[PDB]
Design a protein around this ligand. Structure first.
Ligand SMILES: [Ca+2]
Length: 223
């Protein structure tokens, strides 16, 4: 997160870190046994780390649980990043309390102008590299489909939305990928892509979760 703020320990209780020896992506806890993340975060050997603030210190609220199964969206295209979503099932159910909690799925899509909270352990510099230990947060609005397409001609599908600031300075970044965009208490986005970080006229691009709720629910129901 570039241009954000320190969230506060466990104030984002659905935020997870995907660990393969090191943090490599975020995710969102959507029930006691399932995490949603970005398909471009797929790899084998994932350990889901819940209840994290400092990802380099054991502070007392962590739950570390191995993935038992990963499911990349059937129609994920790694070239275009269309359908950049994946589900991860936990080998055991997480214990849910106020510091570790699932985030509600949307029943309807969000609109341009809604403010949302975006969070993660990604890079904090736009012309630099600095990775935080503690969870960073950014409040950002959803942008219009037309400004999204204008920023990124020929690249924005119906399964993507832009959020952030056209002026630059405030964005998600490398290492936030897979993490949440939460708007009015619903998971509306997944950190997916963008040209650089926090560049002018290059907002963040997010997977549009509301298009996937039927797939998410049926997948959970059969796995
Ligand atoms: Ca920790």
């Amino acid at each position: 997160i570039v241009g954000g703020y320190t969230c506060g320990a466990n104030t984002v209780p659905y935020q997870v870190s995907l660990n393969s020896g090191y943090h490599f992506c975020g995710g969102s806890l959507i029930n006691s046994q399932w995490v949603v993340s970005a398909a471009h975060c797929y790899k084998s050997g994932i350990q889901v780390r819940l209840g994290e603030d400092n990802i380099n210190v054991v502070e007392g609220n962590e739950q570390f649980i191995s993935a038992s199964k990963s499911i990349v969206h059937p129609s994920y295209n790694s070239n275009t990043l269309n359908n950049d979503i994946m589900l991860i099932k936990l080998k055991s159910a997480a214990s849910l309390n106020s510091r570790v909690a699932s985030i509600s799925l949307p029943t309807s899509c969000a609109s341009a102008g809604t403010q949302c909270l975006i969070s993660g352990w990604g890079n904090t510099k736009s012309s630099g590299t600095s990775y935080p230990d503690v969870l960073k947060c950014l409040k950002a609005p959803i942008l219009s489909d037309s400004s999204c397409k204008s920023a990124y001609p020929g690249q924005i599908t119906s399964n993507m939305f832009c959020a952030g600031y056209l002026e630059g300075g405030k964005d998600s970044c490398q290492g936030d990928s897979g993490g949440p965009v939460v708007c009015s208490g619903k998971l509306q986005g997944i950190v997916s892509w963008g040209s650089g970080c926090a560049q002018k006229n290059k907002p963040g691009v997010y997977t549009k979760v509301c298009n996937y709720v039927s797939w998410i629910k049926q997948t959970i129901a059969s796995n």
